Amino acid sequence: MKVAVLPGDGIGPEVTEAALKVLRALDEAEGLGLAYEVFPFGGAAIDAFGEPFPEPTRKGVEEAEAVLLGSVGGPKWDGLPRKIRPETGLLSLRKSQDLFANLRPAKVFPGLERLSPLKEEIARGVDVLIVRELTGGIYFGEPRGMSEAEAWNTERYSKPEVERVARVAFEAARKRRKHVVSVDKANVLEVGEFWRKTVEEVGRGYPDVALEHQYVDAMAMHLVRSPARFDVVVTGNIFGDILSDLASVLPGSLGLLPSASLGRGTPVFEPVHGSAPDIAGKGIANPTAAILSAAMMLEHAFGLVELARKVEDAVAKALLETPPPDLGGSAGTEAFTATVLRHLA
Amino acid sequence: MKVAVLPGDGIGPEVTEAALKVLRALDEAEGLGLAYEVFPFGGAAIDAFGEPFPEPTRKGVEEAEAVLLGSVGGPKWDGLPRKIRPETGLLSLRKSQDLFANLRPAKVFPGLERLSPLKEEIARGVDVLIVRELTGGIYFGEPRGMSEAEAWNTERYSKPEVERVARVAFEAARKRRKHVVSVDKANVLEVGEFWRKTVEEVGRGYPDVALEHQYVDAMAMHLVRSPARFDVVVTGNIFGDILSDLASVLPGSLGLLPSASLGRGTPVFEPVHGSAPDIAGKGIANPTAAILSAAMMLEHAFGLVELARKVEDAVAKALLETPPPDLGGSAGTEAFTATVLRHLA
Ligand SMILES: NC(=O)c1ccc[n+]([C@@H]2O[C@H](COP(=O)([O-])OP(=O)(O)OC[C@H]3O[C@@H](n4cnc5c(N)ncnc54)[C@H](O)[C@@H]3O)[C@@H](O)[C@H]2O)c1
Ligand SMILES: NC(=O)c1ccc[n+]([C@@H]2O[C@H](COP(=O)([O-])OP(=O)(O)OC[C@H]3O[C@@H](n4cnc5c(N)ncnc54)[C@H](O)[C@@H]3O)[C@@H](O)[C@H]2O)c1
């Protein structure tokens, strides 16, 4: 277990140290081979090295088995050249590692339904993982352009692009409830027909996992009326972009959300939230997204699924025993991390 | 007021007769010049005329100032040739009239929050109108295609396409709360930049209406966390397709939803619901979507806004006094239409 730890700016060090305290305690009781190195990343590195993804950091990422990122960005570096912003160094980290699948889970922990915008009955039991394709589709498609009379952009997918993001979904689903919904617009678009066609064939090598297909406009409706029926949801880039934000409002707090980017290189695990300058240094930032990102690392980077689930239960009990300020409690980052560790022991 | 009335199949005649009873009563108290003709449309016309949009119907639509459609479709005509289905004659009706804007409102009437999938506090006061562009974008864009190794489809918009759907949104907003949100993906797509650019300029001729711009992935989140802040929302075809279905789950009943398609020809007004064969003839179908479609006709086809709003209030009181079976009450189509008329008098 060689992890590069890039804490970044704002509350990024704060919540990353909390994730590190959980990983270290877990390494004692279980004897992992946790070996980690902390690096300068974005903003903290613009200050030391004059540039957001400095050469030591790049080597460290390249040499580690997984990255545990915190948060980048901040006022201090906002009006800069777009080349050197903390924020573009984040794109450079994913791009350098050829990360093509973004995994973003939305879970309503037991007893936390009151926070969901949805009624308790509908919010109960939601635990959905949206797998979004990151490297293709309309955001990168050519031809694209704009004249004075019109504009065009191309939604394009090749067969290996679809096959590889669908393999991450089938493999993810195996560790979970073995059900994959693939989302497309196949009744109107040939890219949809193609997508459905390819995932269906990928599904044949995973006979233990059920695959269902749904249209995106109908998935937007199911994610609000009955989100608790889904497990893994895999889709294209623009559709994954809309749907993982829609599912992300269902828990009711930005500090509860972990993410992962898997690909050819070193996988990055990170909180959906940013650097939150307004609450930085106040010792109150909710470390749950970071601790659950570290759990996602145990599961997706090191295949340690029962340990990943042990960390999720400990976090689920902690959120009910001493909730952070953003879920209406009073527990600061330290008091809350300690409740988590109490439930690991 | 010359209306062509195409009741169609299933519960279509049932809920259309209810809309007609409201229009007739209203024509007495106010003295409209309501003159309407009932025509054979889809399914009922495949039986009489062997084809879903027969020549008498086509002439009647063409001669009327507005169309009040009911519902088409049904088992009786399901396995047919795709050329002659009831359902394709519906596409032919919109296409023959050059209808390019689809208007679909989602309203949580007072006291009906309990039906919304969202918590009472969030569901309270939702009254949003999604204006969807119907004729362009990726669903019709060229080039499109599919090889064995890949597929492509083109999201393309011309300047008059955007300008004209945005004009319908600005005009609609004037009769409502004067606020338009335009939805795009302008931080990544040139079609988005173009869309935003053109609506902004259209907005200059409507200085009394506020215009705000939002990204689609962020609109999907706002429509669940705080839908009550919006009034009119105008967007492209694929985005309008996803967002008007997302907003349509917020009331909690398919029988509450009216729609309108405005364009160059004769505007069609219709319930979002279909022909519902399972409850047809049982005298229990909820006529609210049809009565509110007739109200939408008063407002958008004949500019009669205070009369359109009078019908909406009467329907709002009726839903609280004698709710249909689908909102948990016991009132059949007739008993419910009578409560509405009691509140018009
Ligand atoms: N370059 C880009 O494209 C880009 C894009 C987005 C953000 N950024 C940068 O990153 C920073 C992001 O800050 P922001 O305010 O936009 O978003 P944010 O997600 O950091 O914060 C939003 C809100 O949620 C709260 N929050 C976030 N995490 C929390 C946690 N763990 N516990 C409790 N509360 C939490 C914050 O306090 C704040 O009230 C900015 O300063 C910006 O410079 C850059
Ligand atoms: N050709 C096409 O592309 C196409 C597409 C969709 C539907 N159709 C046709 O139209 C018909 C649609 O039927 P469906 O079941 O799919 O959808 P539907 O919307 O008619 O019915 C769905 C459910 O909602 C209920 N419902 C609908 N309106 C109601 C109302 N006013 N009051 C109370 N309950 C109501 C129904 O009873 C049913 O339980 C089908 O028979 C089909 O042939 C064709």
Secondary structure (H, E, C), chain B: CEEEEEEECCCHHHHHHHHHHHHHHHHHHHCCCCEEEECCCCCHHHHHHCCCCCHHHHHHHHHCCEEEEEECCCHHHCCCCCCCCCCHHHHHHHHHCCEEEEEEEEECCCCCHHHCCECHHHHCCCEEEEEEECCCHHHCCCCCEECCCEEEEEEEEEHHHHHHHHHHHHHHHHCCCCEEEEEECCCCCHHHHHHHHHHHHHHCCCCCCEEEEEEHHHHHHHHHHCHHHCCEEEECHHHHHHHHHHHHHCCCCHHHCEEEEEECCCCEEEECCCCCCCCCCCCCCCCHHHHHHHHHHHHHCCCCHHHHHHHHHHHHHHHHHCCCHHHCCCCCHHHHHHHHHHHHC
CA distances from A94 to A36, A158, A229, B217, B218 (A): 20, 20, 31, 21, 23
CA B336 to chain A, closest CA, distance in angstroms equals 27
Residue B13: half-sphere exposure toward Cβ, Cα within 13 Å: 14
- Please give the Cα distance from B283 to B84 (Å, whole number): 29
The reply to whether B245 belongs to the active site is: yes
Sign for the CA dihedral angle at A28, A335, A256, A107 comes to positive
Q: What is the CA radius of gyration of chain B?
A: 20
Give yes or no for a contact between A39 and A57, defined as CB atoms under 8 angstroms apart: yes
The count of domains in chain B is 1
Give yes or no for a contact between B151 and A188, defined as CB atoms under 8 angstroms apart: no
CA distances from B128 to A99, B13, B181, B228, B305 (A): 38, 28, 11, 7, 17
- Please give the Cα distance from A257 to B166 (Å, whole number): 36
Is A236 in a helix, a strand, or coil? Answer: coil
Is A241 in a helix, a strand, or coil? Answer: helix
The parent domain of residue A222 ranges over: 1-345
- Calculate how far, in angstroms, residue B74's C-alpha sits from the geometric centre of ligand 2: 8
Between the two ends of chain A, the Cα-to-Cα distance in Å is: 21
Q: Is the CB of A295 under 6 A from ligand 1?
A: no
Question: Measured in whole angstroms, how far is the alpha carbon of residue B105 from the centre of its chain?
Answer: 7
Angle of helix B12-30 relative to helix B305-321, nearest 10 degrees, comes to: 120
Is A179 in a helix, a strand, or coil? Answer: strand
H-run or E-run covering A16: helix A12-30
A194 and B151 within 8 Å at the Cβ level: the answer is yes
Burial of A302 (0-12, 13-18, 19+ CB in 10 A): middle
Give yes or no for a contact between B277 and B14, defined as CB atoms under 8 angstroms apart: no
β-strands A179-184, A232-235: how paired?
parallel
- Is position A276 annotated in a ligand binding site? yes
Token pair of A206 as six digits: 């995973």
Residues of B in contact with A117 (CB under 8 A): 118-119, 122, 224-225
Sign for the CA dihedral angle at A208, A133, A224, A327 comes to positive
Residues of A in contact with B245 (CB under 8 A): 217-218, 220-221
The reply to whether B231 belongs to the active site is: no
- Calculate how far, in angstroms, residue B223's C-alpha sits from the geometric centre of ligand 1: 21
Mark which residues 48-87 of A lie under 8 Å from B by CB.
none
β-strands B210-215, A268-271: how paired?
unpaired
Neighbours of A322 (CB within 10 A): 17
User: Across the interface, which of B117, B194, B216 has its CB nearest the CB of A151?
Assistant: B194
Give yes or no for a contact between B77 and B86, defined as CB atoms under 8 angstroms apart: yes
- Is position B314 annotated in a ligand binding site? no
Burial of B144 (0-12, 13-18, 19+ CB in 10 A): middle
CA distances from B46 to A42, A195, B76, B288 (A): 67, 36, 10, 27
Measured between CB atoms, does A221 come within 8 Å of chain B?
yes
CA distances from B147 to A182, A198, A215, B240 (A): 21, 12, 22, 28
Could you tell me which chain A residue has the CA closest to the CA of B119?
A119
CA angle A71, A38, A332 (to 5 degrees): 50
β-strands B268-271, B150-158: how paired?
unpaired
Mark which residues 187-206 of A lie under 8 Å from B by CB.
188-191, 193-195
**What technique solved it?**
X-ray
A190 and B224 within 8 Å at the Cβ level: the answer is no
User: Which DSSP symbol is given to A317?
Assistant: H
CATH of the domain at A38: 3.40.718.10
Resolution rounded to one decimal, in angstroms: 2.5
Interface size, chain A vs chain B, as Cβ–Cβ contacts under 8 Å: 140
User: Which DSSP symbol is given to A133?
Assistant: E
Is A77 in a helix, a strand, or coil? Answer: helix
Neighbours of A154 (CB within 10 A): 22
Amino acid at B303: G
User: Across the interface, which of B189, B216, B224 has its CB nearest the CB of A224?
Assistant: B224
- Calculate how far, in angstroms, residue B41's C-alpha sits from the geometric centre of ligand 2: 16
